[PDB]
């Protein structure tokens, strides 16, 4: 799935079929280094590109004065009342008006979507 680099020249490896043993390899084109492929998957493409934006949401966002917050939804970890909520804030998000929540109070940063 991910990209891995050579251990000698730190260039980009490329996948190559081993014709004898039928085992996927990654070889650097600029040298002779070779390493067997562990993942066995190469190219994954998510056309719907459904990605949880909770990975893209920063906890620091809880410090923004310009964002709205509610005391209705408490946090799961610490049970703090304040929770600052906001929409996708992303282009090409398909159609999503879902509210994402970020916990206020220091260092918790728990994010839940309801």
């Amino acid at each position: 799935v991910g990209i891995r680099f050579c251990q000698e020249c730190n260039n980009m490896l490329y996948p190559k079929e081993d014709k004898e043993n039928r085992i996927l390899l990654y070889a650097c084109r600029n040298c002779d280094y070779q390493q067997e492929a562990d993942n066995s998957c190469i190219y994954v493409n998510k056309i719907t590109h459904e990605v949880d934006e909770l990975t893209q949401i920063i906890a620091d966002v809880s410090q923004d004065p310009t964002l709205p917050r509610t005391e209705d939804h408490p946090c799961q970890k610490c049970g703090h009342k304040e929770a600052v909520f906001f929409q996708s804030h992303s282009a090409r998000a398909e159609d999503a008006m879902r509210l994402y929540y970020v916990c206020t109070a220091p260092h918790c940063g728990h994010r839940w979507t309801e």
Binding site: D64, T66, L67, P68, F86, Q87, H89
Partner: peptide, 12 residues
Amino acid sequence: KHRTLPHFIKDD
């Protein structure tokens, strides 16, 4: 940024 005027909260 994500609001019409600075007086309004974001995503209103």
